Amino acid sequence: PAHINDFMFEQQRRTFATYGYAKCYLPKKQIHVWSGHTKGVSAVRLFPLSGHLLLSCSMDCKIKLWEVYGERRCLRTFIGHSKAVRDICFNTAGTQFLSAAYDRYLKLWDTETGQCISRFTNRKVPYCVKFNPDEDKQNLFVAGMSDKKIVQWDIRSGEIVQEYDRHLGAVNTIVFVDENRRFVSTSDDKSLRVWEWDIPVDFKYIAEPSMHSMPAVTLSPNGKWLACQSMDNQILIFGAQNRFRLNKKKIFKGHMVAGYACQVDFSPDMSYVISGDGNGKLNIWDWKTTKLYSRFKAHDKVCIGAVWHPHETSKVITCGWDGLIKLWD
Amino acid sequence: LSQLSKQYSSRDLPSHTKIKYRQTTQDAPEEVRNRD
Amino acid sequence: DAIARQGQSKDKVIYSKYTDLVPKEVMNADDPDLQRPDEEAIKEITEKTRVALEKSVSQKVAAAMPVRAADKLAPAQYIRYTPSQQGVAFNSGAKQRVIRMVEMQKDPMEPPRFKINKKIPRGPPSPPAPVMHSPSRKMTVKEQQE
Amino acid sequence: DFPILCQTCLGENPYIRMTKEKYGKECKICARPFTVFRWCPGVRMRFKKTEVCQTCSKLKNVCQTCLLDLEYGLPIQVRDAGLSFKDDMPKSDVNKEYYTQNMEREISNSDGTRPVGMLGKATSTSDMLLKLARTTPYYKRNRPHICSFWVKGECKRGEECPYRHEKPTDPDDPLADQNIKDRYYGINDPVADKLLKRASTTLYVGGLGDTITETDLRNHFYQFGEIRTITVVQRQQCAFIQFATRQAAEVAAEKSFNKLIVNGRRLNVKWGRSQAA
Amino acid sequence: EMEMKNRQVNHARNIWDRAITTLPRVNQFWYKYTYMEEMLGNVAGARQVFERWMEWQPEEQAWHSYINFELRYKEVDRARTIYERFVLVHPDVK
Amino acid sequence: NMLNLLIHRKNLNYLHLDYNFNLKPVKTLTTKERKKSRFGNAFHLCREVLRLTKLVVDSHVQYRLGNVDAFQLADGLQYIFAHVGQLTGMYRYKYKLMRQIRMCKDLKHLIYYRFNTGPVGKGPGCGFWAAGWRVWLFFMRGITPLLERWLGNLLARQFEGRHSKGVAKTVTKQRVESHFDLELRAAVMHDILDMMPEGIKQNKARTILQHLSEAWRCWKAN
Amino acid sequence: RKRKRGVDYNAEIPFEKKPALGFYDTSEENYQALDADFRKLRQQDLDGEL
RNA sequence: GUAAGAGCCUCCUUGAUGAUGUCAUACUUAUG
RNA sequence: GGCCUCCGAACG
RNA sequence: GUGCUCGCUUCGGCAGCACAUAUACUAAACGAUACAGAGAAGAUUAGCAUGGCCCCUGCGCAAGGAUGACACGCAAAUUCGUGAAGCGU
């Protein structure tokens, strides 16, 4: 160590800047869907009364109006959606429609007029949108959102209808029955719960550790049974509820579930049920025989879902996938 | 290490700071070396 | 044979070749070999153990006994050394560019400075040695089945 | 027992008053208590400090304050990626890194601060880092500390207090000071920006002289490929290297342009005419 | 064995040598040495295996099997001297 | 600010510290908040030292400034220090300190009635308790190191936090038998491993169950 | 969700998870061998459905 | 009757049915 | 002729 | 810069002594909530134990948080009999 007094002079020179160093039906593909979209199909809709007009919803956030059945070409284009449509809906007559947009914006759409209806919003991103059965007025629509409460919404009155929480899980989809006193509610909690709806109180809840999510939910046209395909690729047919049991049809396996919700299809001859597969193959099932039909691969991409013709006799079944849709005879 | 010294506790207080060497009356090491 | 020194190698290993298997000759009588070094070795070793145990016992016993140590220290610590032998362009100073190095201000009434209290127990491995054992005979059918 | 304290953060003043700190803030990398030394290189410049611990400074082998690349005085990232590949595990779980660092330093018996220097044999990256480094880049490396109060006119003290007026810069591109301070080893950074900026049949070579012979140029250029011939002109102190294939002529061409040091003497090499003149 | 199934096998052979420098156990050293020598490095593997087996303790089935494999490999000339050294290390009627 | 800093360090808001030396559960927190509140030992000790401290503090403050006291200041000083100083807010954390010291305060009452007895007396007749204030001051002279390392190690452990496993075994009671059985099964595993020269590895682990339980039912039964 | 710890191993994102130490054969750095082991390593893992 | 936890402030597979309601008995409720 | 142990707070 | 000394020649001009390198660590998990409620072979629960990549209360190597909570069975490798087909110098 050096001297501290010398370090003081060295610091003083440093401040001075001194540098000195000194017998089953076999349907086949009929025709491709009208037009199409690059983005995956968001929802598959169709005209309930006519059946010829199909409304294709895609992830492109543009509602695609399609004319389909016969002389095959689409309908027109529909815009105005803020973000990708989470769900699609339509009125009983078909001239009016409802839209559920992942922007958390529910926008009704007029179709036959060439343009939509109006733009609306909700509290959270709606996970389900469905029209109200029974009374032909239906000022409210049965819907559901990430808030985990099935809520009907009155529209033409300027404000919604009511909100009711059946379960703590986010409602995946809601399909109201014909009795109008109960509406089947499937939620992300995996618990299938019917809900008394018009009354603020629900109905009942069942099967929380079963029926994984809600990949497919459907009911027979006769209303005797409602089957729901589950994300284990396990189709659980539930005998519909009026009873002490009030559930449980049968068990139908053989499908494929990749986790994406697939639109369930059937042939309502009292015969068949057909739905898409998670791998993209076309799932054909014989139903009333308690066993399926056959698995015929159709779409090259992940199958979004499928639809069926009206109920008269065997006719044809439409199909759709991600990025493209194909109808089968 | 240079760490892990923060707070003390009981029973760790200074104790027996002065040891006790063997007295010539009790045990002597040289007497034990020369012991009979 | 030098491959056994891979990893950390400093002083004490004393297993490479197998020549240490059988001992060397037999027990013999020799003053340096069979007894010990002189008394000055135990005296200097005991004094060194008193210095090391005095420093370690002083730091550990001083920290474990909050007598508040001392005031601070007197390390004026005038440091004349090459700045990492840089040899940079031109000159950053005069000669080795010495600097003044003193102690640090004492600790205030607040004990906390940096609190860790985390958990990282063990986690280093240890270098494996050779077996260094005479292989025995197996138990065959009878002794193993017994 | 001083810190790293390289020549960049030392300053131009031969004498410097430094104040050590026994227990400082925890290291940003090693996350352990260490010593924090403070010094002011400039007259009116703010006092410096070292946020890297002894294990943090020994792991990256960098200055405790400037944290440049090794002793070469370059940016850490670029020169580290140029050394071999990476050879580090800063990522996650410092508890697992405390075992590799504790066993690292505890198992390493050869180290030091400055009783040593150089003692290497050339290097692969010494030319790129040497061309990528400047002479004492001490400009605006300490004092300015941009302040928003003087920019809005709300500062009462003004220039009397630190953080002198007109310090800030356009908030568009990296700030060259705190931008590299946001991350540590993660970002590509002006290390990589100035690294890419630093990266950018006959061959004539001048500046040979009596120290350089024809065998040295034939052996140096022969590693690229087969050479057709060599013309050694001692009067002009130049040599023409003719190769059979223009591939090695292009390799040794571009790599031989102001990169050629033969026997410690730089050589200026220009591409051959080949215009039939 | 897990590293030996890899396509590299260089770090698996070097790891086998690291196990040789580790505890030989007179089981995995002779067995693993026979596996490496059977994999490749005939002259080299038999050389390091003969130096290791000739370093710490003699053997019986491993020494006789090593001299048999080294004899059937190419020539029995070196295996004769190695058999005389191994037999001289532990003489017996067998 | 000391108690407000104690409750300020670890966010609680389950009670409020009152300069009366009274912390009350305003929001009335219970369950996990009840288990997380506590502060009934060291914080109650500092509430006692600050209870008598701030007590006599505000007492002399009211004496000097505001309401005139004088003879009433010495009155409430000796009296209130004796009876009130004997009760006050100390209680729990004192224990033998305010027990034997409280008996010393009773002796200070015997000195009170002793000194002034015959001619007259009714209320706080003075007889200043500053001697007993030196008694309790000696209780704070002995306890001040105890509460000094108490608040030092407690406050130091507050910002630091609970360390890793600190051993601290052999709690006696019925736990000494469990350590004797575990340690009994410990050396039995080493000697059991040393019983067979080769044998097997995993086969020795299952023997601890057969020998263990076999000895249990063996000695415990006939 | 919150990145500190989780329902899995702490900090674990299985790239260089847990200390891997290192290995050297004899007094040398093997380069092309490790590159071939990494090439075959990438050849073992393939994208598909199973 | 209640300690704890969670998040929102570019190519495939082995074919067993269903809807009309009431008693002894078993299990789950802080409504006695 | 006298003698007067007593002395509570949490947690659980 | 002040104070002092005519120290040198003007009241102020010049000279000498004494006071002599601050600041920086300067300035700019726990709240709230739905849910459901708790191990030891048929129903209920005493408790104390063992290792952490889990902690709080508690000055504390006292102790306390439903037994404070977390916590299931994979083995380093074979050997002999019967029948059928193909090939064989």
From Swiss-Prot, chain A:
The keyword Phosphoprotein applies. This is Pre-mRNA-processing factor 17. The reaction is catalyzed by PPIL1. WD repeats lie at residues 36-76, 80-119, 121-163, 166-205, 209-248, 254-295, 298-328. Keywords: Disease variant, Intellectual disability, mRNA processing, mRNA splicing, Nucleus, Phosphoprotein, Repeat, Spliceosome, WD repeat. It is linked to Pontocerebellar hypoplasia 15: A form of pontocerebellar hypoplasia, a disorder characterized by structural defects of the pons and cerebellum, evident upon brain imaging. PCH15 is a severe autosomal recessive form characterized by progressive microcephaly, and poor or absent psychomotor development with severely impaired intellectual development apparent from birth. Other features may include spastic quadriplegia, early-onset seizures, and chronic anemia and thrombocytopenia. GO terms for biological process: embryonic brain development; mRNA splicing, via spliceosome. It comes from Homo sapiens. GO terms for cellular component: catalytic step 2 spliceosome; nuclear speck; nucleoplasm; U2-type catalytic step 2 spliceosome. Coiled coil: none annotated. The gene is CDC40. It is found in: Nucleus; Nucleus speckle. One of its GO terms (molecular function) is RNA binding. Required for pre-mRNA splicing as component of the activated spliceosome. Plays an important role in embryonic brain development; this function does not require proline isomerization.
Swiss-Prot record, chain B:
It is found in: Nucleus. It comes from the Eukaryota. Transmembrane segments: none annotated. The modification Phosphothreonine is found at T25. Residues 2-12 have a biased composition (Polar residues). Involved in pre-mRNA splicing as component of the spliceosome. Component of the PRP19-CDC5L complex that forms an integral part of the spliceosome and is required for activating pre-mRNA splicing. As a component of the minor spliceosome, involved in the splicing of U12-type introns in pre-mRNAs. Belongs to the CWC15 family. Identified in the spliceosome C complex. Component of the PRP19-CDC5L splicing complex composed of a core complex comprising a homotetramer of PRPF19, CDC5L, PLRG1 and BCAS2, and at least three less stably associated proteins CTNNBL1, CWC15 and HSPA8. Interacts directly with CTNNBL1 in the complex. Component of the minor spliceosome, which splices U12-type introns. This is Spliceosome-associated protein CWC15 homolog. It comes from Homo sapiens (Human). The chain holds residues 23 to 58 of 229 of the full protein.
Swiss-Prot record, chain E:
It is found in: Nucleus; Nucleus speckle. Widely expressed. Highly expressed in testis. Not detected in brain and lung. HAT repeats lie at residues 7-39, 41-72, 74-94. Identified in the spliceosome C complex. Present in a spliceosome complex assembled in vitro containing CRNKL1, HPRP8BP and SNRPB2. Component of the minor spliceosome, which splices U12-type introns. Isoform 2 seems to be predominant in the spliceosome complex. Interacts with PPIL2 (via the PPIase cyclophilin-type domain); they may form a trimeric complex with HSP90. Involved in pre-mRNA splicing process. As a component of the minor spliceosome, involved in the splicing of U12-type introns in pre-mRNAs. Belongs to the crooked-neck family. This is Crooked neck-like protein 1. It comes from Homo sapiens. The chain holds residues 284 to 377 of 848 of the full protein.
Swiss-Prot record, chain F:
The MPN (JAB/Mov34) domain mediates interaction with TSSC4 and SNRNP200. Has structural similarity with deubiquitinating enzymes, but lacks the residues that would bind the catalytic metal ion. Part of the U5 snRNP complex. Component of the U4/U6-U5 tri-snRNP complex composed of the U4, U6 and U5 snRNAs and at least PRPF3, PRPF4, PRPF6, PRPF8, PRPF31, SNRNP200, TXNL4A, SNRNP40, DDX23, CD2BP2, PPIH, SNU13, EFTUD2, SART1 and USP39. Component of the U5.U4atac/U6atac snRNP complexes in U12-dependent spliceosomes. Within the minor spliceosome, which acts on U12-type introns, interacts with PPIL2 and RBM48. Core component of U2-type precatalytic, catalytic and postcatalytic spliceosomal complexes. Found in a mRNA splicing-dependent exon junction complex (EJC) with SRRM1. It comes from Homo sapiens (Human). It is found in: Nucleus; Nucleus speckle. This is Pre-mRNA-processing-splicing factor 8. Widely expressed.
